[PDB]
Amino acid sequence: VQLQESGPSLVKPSQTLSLTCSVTGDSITSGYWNWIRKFPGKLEYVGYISYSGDTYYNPSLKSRISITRDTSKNQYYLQLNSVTSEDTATYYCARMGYGSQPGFGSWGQGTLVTVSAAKTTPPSVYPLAPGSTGSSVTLGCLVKGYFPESVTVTWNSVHTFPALLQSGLYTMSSSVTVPSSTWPSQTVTCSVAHPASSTTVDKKLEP
Amino acid sequence: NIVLTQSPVSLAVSLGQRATISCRASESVDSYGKSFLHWYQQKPGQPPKLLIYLASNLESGVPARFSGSGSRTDFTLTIDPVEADDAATYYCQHNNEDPWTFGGGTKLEIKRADAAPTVSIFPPSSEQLTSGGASVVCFLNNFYPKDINVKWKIDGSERNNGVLNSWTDQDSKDSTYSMSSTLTLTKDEYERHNSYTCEATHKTSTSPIVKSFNRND
Amino acid sequence: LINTNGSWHV
Secondary structure (H helix, E strand, O other), X not given: OEEEEEOOOEEOOOOOEEEEEEEEOOOXXXXXXXXXXXXXXXXXXXXXXEOOOOEEEOOOOOOOEEEEEEOOOOEEEEEEOOOOHHHOEEEEEEXXXXXXXXXXXXXXXXXXXXXXOOOOEOOEEEEEOOOOOOOEEEEEEEEEEEEOOOOXXXXXXXXXXXXXXXXXXXXXXXXXXEEOOOOOOOOOEEEEEEHHHXXXXXXXXXX | OOOEEEEOOEEEEOOOOOEEEEEEEOOOOEEOXXXXXXXXXXXOOOOOEEEEEOOOEEOOOOOOOEEEEEEOOEEEEEEOOOOHHHOEEEEEEEOOOOOOEEOOOEEEEEOOOOEOOEEEEEOOOHHHHHOOEEEEEEXXXXXXXXXXXXXXXXXXXXXXXXXXXXXXXOOOOOOOXXXXXXXXXXXXXXXXXXXXXXXXXXXXXXXXXXXXXXOOO | OXXXXXXXXX
């Protein structure tokens, strides 16, 4: 079985958050189909829809949530009304078995939803090349001024530095170390994807 | 309410040793002769992974370096032998009755040999300078232990304002850490000084590791 | 066992 979440990256306060889980390799007419979320800091159970369409919700969310399904599409859905900054989290879908396999055995990769009135801003990507040579060379990219999270940096010996928020915008960075015999003689590029702005910046490192 | 209290908050263990983590429930999580208490591993950027279910059953596809015990209110997860790939947060969770809840997590650190950072300094890019800004960056890569402090000096004078420091999670292969330090200035401030230095204080040296450059030199 | 309303039963 494989699960995959989809939905928006950014939702405004007071609006309804709507997420979809697309299940492949197994039917949702068996098992329990769950939603779980992880806050920026904590994991919280959200609820399920069963093999027969019955639901179970976290009691602190029961007045704002709805879990529904479409067995013909093998999809199930989460609706969370009247969202606030407290609903910013990574949302996961997960399968549970019955009494003999009651753990969350299969999970989707998760999707980060930010609740904010701020606008989506794509990143500026700056190359990090040594100033005016050993057996190895470390290069990097500085990814600044974007909102909301997340970005993925691909090179094409890597370190991904987690983003930090300052004055409403995120900054992150990434480093790569390669043999000095492969750069600058061959191309080294950092590809920075920002799904929330549908933008990718592919920056070539120049000496 | 059923509250799952894990212990310890964090722990550091050597490769090959037996590590044990506890989960204490405020009320019993048993029913029908079963303990509806399960354990997960979670790494950054990944969903949790089920290790153990029903307190003591190994999840299919997980290597048998994980085991669990306990019943009613007291449970233990054992990792044995500890491997470098075990650097992660471990959670217990129950589903015995409403409300289903998770523990708060235990962070597992892998002990390894002390290692000084590899330090690299980078001047602002021509692209950023064209926009009126100037960020100077220092990478401190592949060091251990995690405790390291970076100090920026502009013309030999310490600068605290405009600095952002970010650490990686522990490396799953070599058990080191890395961190990035960015000093952000205006292009006008940057062009009023010549010497830019990042100094790294760590237990691996009595004196800090210093990397520097001189603007337009 | 099956789950209903968060609890397991036969």
